[PDB]
Design a protein around this ligand. Structure first.
Ligand SMILES: C=CC1=C(C)[C@@H](Cc2[nH]c(/C=C3N=C(/C=C4\NC(=O)[C@H](C)[C@H]4CC)C(C)=C\3CCC(=O)O)c(CCC(=O)O)c2C)NC1=O
Ligand SMILES: C=CC1=C(C)[C@@H](Cc2[nH]c(/C=C3N=C(/C=C4\NC(=O)[C@H](C)[C@H]4CC)C(C)=C\3CCC(=O)O)c(CCC(=O)O)c2C)NC1=O
Ligand SMILES: C=CC1=C(C)[C@@H](Cc2[nH]c(/C=C3N=C(/C=C4\NC(=O)[C@H](C)[C@H]4CC)C(C)=C\3CCC(=O)O)c(CCC(=O)O)c2C)NC1=O
Ligand SMILES: C=CC1=C(C)[C@@H](Cc2[nH]c(/C=C3N=C(/C=C4\NC(=O)[C@H](C)[C@H]4CC)C(C)=C\3CCC(=O)O)c(CCC(=O)O)c2C)NC1=O
Ligand SMILES: C=CC1=C(C)[C@@H](Cc2[nH]c(/C=C3N=C(/C=C4\NC(=O)[C@H](C)[C@H]4CC)C(C)=C\3CCC(=O)O)c(CCC(=O)O)c2C)NC1=O
Ligand SMILES: C=CC1=C(C)[C@@H](Cc2[nH]c(/C=C3N=C(/C=C4\NC(=O)[C@H](C)[C@H]4CC)C(C)=C\3CCC(=O)O)c(CCC(=O)O)c2C)NC1=O
Ligand SMILES: C=CC1=C(C)[C@@H](Cc2[nH]c(/C=C3N=C(/C=C4\NC(=O)[C@H](C)[C@H]4CC)C(C)=C\3CCC(=O)O)c(CCC(=O)O)c2C)NC1=O
Ligand SMILES: C=CC1=C(C)[C@@H](Cc2[nH]c(/C=C3N=C(/C=C4\NC(=O)[C@H](C)[C@H]4CC)C(C)=C\3CCC(=O)O)c(CCC(=O)O)c2C)NC1=O
Ligand SMILES: C=CC1=C(C)[C@@H](Cc2[nH]c(/C=C3N=C(/C=C4\NC(=O)[C@H](C)[C@H]4CC)C(C)=C\3CCC(=O)O)c(CCC(=O)O)c2C)NC1=O
Ligand SMILES: C=CC1=C(C)[C@@H](Cc2[nH]c(/C=C3N=C(/C=C4\NC(=O)[C@H](C)[C@H]4CC)C(C)=C\3CCC(=O)O)c(CCC(=O)O)c2C)NC1=O
Ligand SMILES: CCC1=C(C)/C(=C/C2=NC(=C\c3[nH]c(/C=C4\NC(=O)[C@H](C)[C@H]4CC)c(C)c3CCC(=O)O)/C(CCC(=O)O)=C2C)NC1=O
Lengths: 162, 227, 172, 160, 162, 162, 172, 172
């Protein structure tokens, strides 16, 4: 998985080389941001539930047709609502992982790769989740550097779906 | 069966020993199958090979090959066979082959697979004959089974641009996909030249009176800002 | 490729000297302002798609040439190529914003490129207008006083505008 | 100019200026500030008139910017808009002069021989000046763009 | 030139990618060590002369045959002494560069590449320079983390010549 | 461009080969279906206008939020509504091209390639156009084999967008 | 590559139109005559070797320059390269006879070729004489009233002689 | 690709004749002296590194430009590139000394020296001085009356100084 650490060891390994002072400086810089990263990671875990329910609700309010169309894909059933909260839950989970790891490696591994084929075969628009993530980016409640750590990744997923 | 004619030979960078003990940078990442990479690093190899042949522009979803990926990830082929079956794939033929004037497709093959510029014009001549008779298949068979390609990439490595940047100097050589882009200078000439290109000239307008003349101080301004 | 540092040390070694005290002190000032630099590059990357597509909307809206059938945005495929070229030039401007020196932007992207958009019949003047549509947007997101403490960033915003002006000057 | 035309007129008649011509000079020198306002506005709005008039020209007339056209290419289009800039400048000269003499002698005397020697369709040039007339009439008042617009109309009558 | 910065740019360039948060963490870590790096860099420039002279003198005291061997390659002339101090001057120069840049990139570019072929074609001995660098490593007079920044690179050149 | 003809010539070119009996059989088969293909091609061109307007109308009736959503990407403008009929006109155009040529080559060249990146970067839902093509497929008015020649390609575009 | 059809569609799309009924009617006529075209291409392919070698015999018989030493037919390798080049040009004339339009013949073979037989010191005028030795033989086999029902094929032989004249005009 | 023999055979066949008795007799004389040629190539190979390094000492001693910073011998890596390029040109002179004809020297090393150097900002005239430092030493070791009994080899030293002068004439 792409961490800063595995990235630096991978590069120095590909150059057939010991870890010089450069890569050790990089790992240092991972450690001296990691505290803000974990403060951001604990508050997201600390109120993950309400972020999900509020996110799905915001998606419903912006797109009123989703709760009204008589189709399997749309959240007009008792199933698409649960599955709607399921998917939003997945994204919030991955963001918390990337805040712990320190790069976008977990989201790029477990989530980003192959997502076009899912959203193409199951007729799901890119925006729905965009709207969800915009609500989470507006209402995570972090402050300062922890908020930069969260908004980086939450913006990043929006850059993926757009 | 009429072998390839004897051609000349030039002197480029790829035939010297830049010892470079302990590589600075610029050494294209060894994206292979030898290091037993997991799912991600496999995806990075797959993307790096795609960029290499197709390049960034032709790496779109329609162009992408699922099946040779699924075979490669599972060990059913070598990377060399992946690069080969890549070029034989027809989406590469509709774009980069049907456009290119036969001597020019020889550039992008000897140059996108071997990572070196052509030695002289005669090379383009001979290799364009063998792709003109045997078909694209046996030409790519010639380049891949060649002694050179086995000597430096072996069985599982994505081809790279060899010695693009000399030690210390920043400039070096222009990137490869930049160098031979696709369309070509004279390909259009035979058809209608691209119509309706005027508006870019309209959006940018300088009065003739504003234009610098010889001997003004302003012409040298750029030099002053670099010092 | 060369950053801020390697340019100074490359000049100093190319003359074969030590670094004088004056060079070291200015280099200390650059290190002493480097958080702002990181902040800008963070605010570009995390909005990069939006920058690209909004500047594309502006571009094709103001020049309706290109998407009409005989232009270069007309082909659905050519259209995609157009967009991702804008993404490419934005990527290298972000690199040269981090490194401080126009080194990676002047060898890997801009060098050779005006030659290339003359082999394809693509109007490079229109490409420079696209870059002028990205500069505006990128600086307009760079100067967002939001989540970031208050302070002075004109000395850096100006530096940012150098690179976008250099790409526009070099595709034409 | 009007002064030049009157002096040359009674000079070839070898007499001084008549009262009718001196009244004409009075009306001219009292109409001055209005003229200078008009040429001031067309001066400071030149890039809108050249650009927008060039757009309406090339959109109405896709001949000359098509492949095989006189202006096909970046350099050629730039030269085309350069000439529209010339005729805009000359219209402003004709406005401050109060007479088409500045326009005629700088721009119109033997224009067809030149553009026939360049391969340029001069009807495209007249359509370009008509496009700049539409833009410049969009930038002015009623009577104002009547006056200036009629200077443009003189240039169109010289091209056609 | 291999910096931390150009390393990060180079890796994300090879992945066809923007800079994410990982690379920015690396650049952070370069900046948060750079002050001690410059303290180290100023003092070595501040007394480079006496370090050179002391170093060449130590090379002579360890290897007494060098000052006595009749040859082109040995400092028994008035030339090999000045050229001896010339080369020692070069090493110390490159170490001060690497302290400013923040990796071994200047030494790997300007010094390390092809040095075995020089010391093979010119009958030079790796140990000589090893002895010089040992004296410099013993007598630079830095304290604390600046001394670690000096001794890292000074050790690094010894790893190259051995 | 992929025709039947250029497919056969391309294969026999790649084999370094004359046109044998096989490719001549292929071109025969193209000739003996081309009549129905052109009958289908004429009627679609004959009333293309009402097909476009009916199609955009059907998209509006299925998705009423599109005519109501304030944005640049939605047909709530005079302009948004105008563009909509532009793109539906493109789909009908390419189907008429493929009916004339006899393969999906004009649609695969001019239309299909890179379509995901457009619908990802400009937030265009795959379904809108799906609904448009469903109306075209239901209301073209062909009969018999001409209707099969139209519905093959009209189905084909839906297989592309799904 | 483009056939008869894709040229019409390529022009029509490059202007961004539907096909009018007039283009469709003429295109119906072309489809209604396509059998004859396949017949000619059959009669070329099934005799193609014999065409090549008999035109080679004629060529070297009338110009005894090239084989007697110093010329280009002298070396065995060159002699064979000469023969197969004749086979190449015959191959692409057969292709462009099937496709209807001089498209595959004007980008893969003919375009750039005159430049190539000036990099090798080969007389391209002698190549044009070789093509004039293939045109006569090919038309002489095209007009074989054998195994095939009677009809009118002058309007298509006038379409076959164009390509052979175009290759002879384009290597010189 | 053509030794001294294959050039004569190539001329004779290019005219398409038998080898006359005169060519055969001179060729007999060449074979009758070819042991001395092998002896000289042995005396070059077995001292080649020493030749190179001694001519390098001479080069940098006479022109102190190159090593003091700003020149081309100043970089450690560039220093070694200088030496190796001298090794390259000595290698190919050894090749063309064995073959008798400047064929391998005129296609494998000669073609890329002028173009590359002027692209490296290297004084090719100084390269030619390096080769003039190698010619002296190489002939001085070729004329070593040691280990081999005495004979006449000025006739063959002329044949060796041709190649060294050809490289010096061709990097400039
Ligand atoms: C690892 C990451 C990961 C994800 C992010 C999801 C993404 C995802 N969602 C669905 C599938 C689904 N996702 C939704 C969600 C939606 N309902 C709506 O009203 C909204 C538009 C939207 C929530 C915002 C629905 C309704 C389905 C079922 C669609 C259907 O069957 O019609 C599927 C197909 C498989 C399935 O049915 O579960 C996948 C892969 N799955 C993963 O493995
Ligand atoms: C490393 C740097 C780097 C770049 C900067 C690009 C530059 C570049 N662009 C294209 C290619 C292209 N670039 C564009 C872009 C344009 N579309 C328009 O409407 C505008 C005029 C313009 C965007 C502003 C298009 C449309 C193509 C495809 C052209 C074609 O095939 O007709 C090609 C040829 C290969 C390809 O098809 O992708 C190259 C080398 N590539 C690189 O490797
Ligand atoms: C790894 C990622 C990473 C970042 C993204 C930055 C984020 C960052 N910015 C600042 C700090 C700051 N950031 C800015 C930036 C600006 N303020 C303005 O009003 C302008 C809008 C904007 C122009 C760029 C300013 C002015 C400061 C405070 C001054 C300073 O510390 O130099 C700090 C200091 C600590 C703190 O404030 O708590 C940090 C860590 N650093 C990192 O390590
Ligand atoms: C940038 C890095 C860099 C280096 C690492 C040196 C390496 C180097 N040293 C010498 C050359 C030399 N180096 C020395 C140095 C000395 N020999 C002794 O016996 C003493 C112990 C020792 C001084 C302490 C000497 C005396 C020479 C000249 C003769 C020789 O080869 O020994 C040369 C050949 C050119 C010349 O004569 O100057 C080179 C390339 N030069 C560089 O530019
Ligand atoms: C009463 C007299 C008295 C002394 C003379 C000191 C001496 C002393 N210093 C340290 C320990 C130390 N002393 C220093 C001091 C510094 N190291 C640097 O590199 C800087 C240049 C320098 C500050 C200017 C440091 C950093 C340590 C801990 C690590 C080390 O050994 O360097 C220790 C070990 C115990 C400890 O960690 O504190 C002792 C006994 N202590 C005393 O009580
Ligand atoms: C060659 C084939 C080809 C296509 C098929 C189109 C596809 C396409 N449409 C748009 C762009 C667009 N397409 C639409 C169309 C829509 N309006 C709605 O209400 C509906 C959902 C939908 C019609 C059914 C709109 C509104 C835009 C502009 C979106 C925006 O700027 O917000 C763009 C981006 C460039 C532009 O702004 O024009 C592209 C590539 N273009 C091509 O070159
Ligand atoms: C697709 C288009 C296409 C062409 C236009 C040719 C062009 C061409 N011809 C040759 C090569 C050649 N072409 C010929 C042909 C002949 N020389 C003579 O003196 C005769 C007069 C003449 C036969 C009539 C010969 C003999 C060679 C090999 C030697 C030479 O260069 O002359 C080569 C070099 C490769 C090779 O040896 O085959 C090329 C590229 N090849 C193609 O694939
Ligand atoms: C796969 C390969 C393949 C072929 C090679 C053709 C061969 C062929 N030609 C015809 C049929 C025909 N072919 C011709 C052609 C001719 N007109 C003349 O003036 C000339 C003598 C000659 C062209 C050189 C004509 C005129 C007919 C119709 C004969 C008739 O109905 O009288 C038929 C009978 C079916 C039909 O009417 O089309 C067949 C099988 N068909 C194939 O499927
Ligand atoms: C396979 C490699 C190979 C070689 C390299 C030679 C080496 C060689 N040279 C000689 C023999 C000889 N070589 C020379 C050459 C010399 N004359 C001089 O003035 C110079 C010093 C020197 C040329 C530079 C002479 C003169 C003899 C004859 C010595 C004698 O008989 O006195 C002999 C003894 C057999 C003979 O008489 O030919 C051998 C083995 N032979 C080989 O088989
Ligand atoms: C097959 C034949 C063949 C050659 C003949 C060489 C020629 C050659 N030399 C250099 C490159 C070089 N060559 C030299 C040599 C010189 N140093 C000086 O002081 C002198 C002027 C000169 C020795 C006489 C140097 C110094 C470089 C590196 C230049 C630089 O990077 O500044 C390069 C560029 C690639 C590289 O850096 O190695 C090439 C192609 N290479 C080949 O493949
Ligand atoms: C002040 C009075 C004055 C005028 C007007 C003038 C015009 C003038 N127009 C020129 C060219 C040109 N002018 C045009 C103009 C056009 N092409 C079209 O299709 C359109 C109809 C039209 C633009 C509206 C073009 C295409 C050329 C260059 C043609 C060529 O060089 O092939 C040149 C040739 C060299 C040069 O420009 O420097 C002159 C001197 N010179 C003068 O002294």
């Amino acid at each position: 998985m792409k961490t800063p650490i595995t990235e630096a060891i991978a590069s120095a390994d590909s150059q057939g080389r010991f870890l010089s002072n450069a890569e050790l400086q990089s790992i240092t810089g991972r450690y001296q941001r990691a505290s803000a990263s974990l403060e951001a990671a604990k508050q997201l875990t600390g109120n993950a539930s309400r972020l999900i329910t509020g996110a799905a609700q915001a998606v419903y309010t912006k797109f009123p047709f989703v709760t009204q169309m008589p189709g399997p894909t749309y959240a007009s059933n008792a199933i698409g609502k649960a599955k709607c909260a399921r998917d939003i839950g997945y994204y919030l989970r991955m963001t918390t992982y990337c805040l712990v790891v320190g790069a976008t490696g977990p989201m790029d591994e477990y989530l980003v790769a192959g997502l076009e084929e899912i959203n193409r075969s199951f007729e799901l628009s890119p925006s729905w989740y965009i709207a969800a993530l915009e609500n989470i980016k507006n209402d995570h409640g972090l402050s300062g550097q922890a908020a930069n750590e969260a908004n980086t990744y939450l913006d990043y997923a929006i850059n993926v779906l757009s | 069966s009429i072998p390839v004619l004897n051609y000349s030979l030039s002197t480029q960078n790829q035939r010297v020993y830049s010892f470079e003990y302990l590589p600075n940078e610029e050494q294209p990442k060894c994206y292979t199958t030898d290091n037993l990479p997991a799912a991600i690093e496999m995806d990075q190899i797959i993307w790096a090979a795609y960029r290499q042949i197709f390049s960034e522009h032709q790496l779109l979803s329609s162009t992408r090959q699922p099946f040779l990926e699924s075979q490669l990830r599972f060990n059913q082929i070598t990377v060399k066979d992946f690069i080969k079956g890549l070029i034989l794939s027809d989406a590469f033929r509709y774009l980069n082959y049907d456009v290119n004037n036969n001597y020019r497709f020889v550039e992008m093959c000897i140059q996108r697979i071997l990572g070196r510029e052509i030695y002289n014009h005669r090379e383009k001549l001979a290799f364009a004959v063998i792709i003109g008779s045997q078909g694209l298949e046996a030409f790519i068979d010639l380049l891949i089974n060649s002694e050179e390609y086995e000597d430096n990439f072996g069985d599982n490595m994505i081809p790279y641009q060899r010695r693009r940047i000399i030690a210390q100097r920043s400039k070096g050589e222009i990137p490869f996909n930049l160098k031979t882009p696709r369309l070509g200078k004279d390909f259009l000439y035979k058809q209608g030249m691209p119509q309706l290109l005027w508006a870019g000239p309209v959006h940018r307008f300088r009065p003739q009176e504003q234009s610098p003349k010889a001997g003004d101080p302003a012409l040298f301004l750029s030099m002053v800002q670099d010092l | 490729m060369l950053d801020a540092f390697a340019k100074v040390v490359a000049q100093a070694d190319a003359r074969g000297e030590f670094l004088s005290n004056k060079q070291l002190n200015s280099l200390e000032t650059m290190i002493g302002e480097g958080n702002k630099r990181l902040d800008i590059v963070n605010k570009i990357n995390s909005n990069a798609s939006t920058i690209v597509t909004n500047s594309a909307r502006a571009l094709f809206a103001e020049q309706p040439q290109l998407i009409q059938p005989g232009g270069n945005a007309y082909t659905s495929r050519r259209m995609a190529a157009c967009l991702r070229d804008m993404e490419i030039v934005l990527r290298y401007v972000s690199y040269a914003m981090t490194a401080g020196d126009s080194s990676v932007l002047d060898d890997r992207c801009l060098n050779g490129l005006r030659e290339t958009y003359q082999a394809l019949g693509t109007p490079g003047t229109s490409v420079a207008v696209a870059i002028q549509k990205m500069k505006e947007a990128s600086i307009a997101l760079a100067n967002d006083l939001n989540g970031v403490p208050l302070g002075d960033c004109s000395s850096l915003n100006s530096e940012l505008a150098v690179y976008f002006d250099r790409a526009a000057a070099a595709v034409v | 100019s009007i002064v030049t035309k009157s002096i040359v007129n009674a000079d070839a008649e070898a007499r001084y200026l008549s009262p009718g011509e001196l009244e004409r000079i009075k009306s001219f020198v009292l109409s001055g500030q209005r003229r200078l306002r008009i040429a001031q506005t067309l001066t400071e709005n030149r890039e809108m008139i050249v650009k927008k008039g060039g757009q309406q020209l090339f959109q109405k007339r896709t001949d000359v910017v098509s492949p095989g056209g006189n202006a096909y290419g970046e350099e050629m289009t730039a030269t085309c808009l350069r000439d529209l800039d010339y005729y805009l400048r000359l219209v402003t000269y004709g406005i401050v002069a109060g007479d088409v003499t500045p326009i005629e002698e700088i721009g119109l005397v033997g224009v067809k021989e030149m553009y026939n020697s360049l391969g340029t369709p001069i009807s495209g040039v007249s359509e370009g000046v008509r496009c700049m007339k539409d833009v410049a009439c969009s930038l002015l008042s009623g009577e104002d763009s009547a006056e200036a617009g009629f200077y443009f109309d003189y240039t169109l009558g010289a091209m056609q």
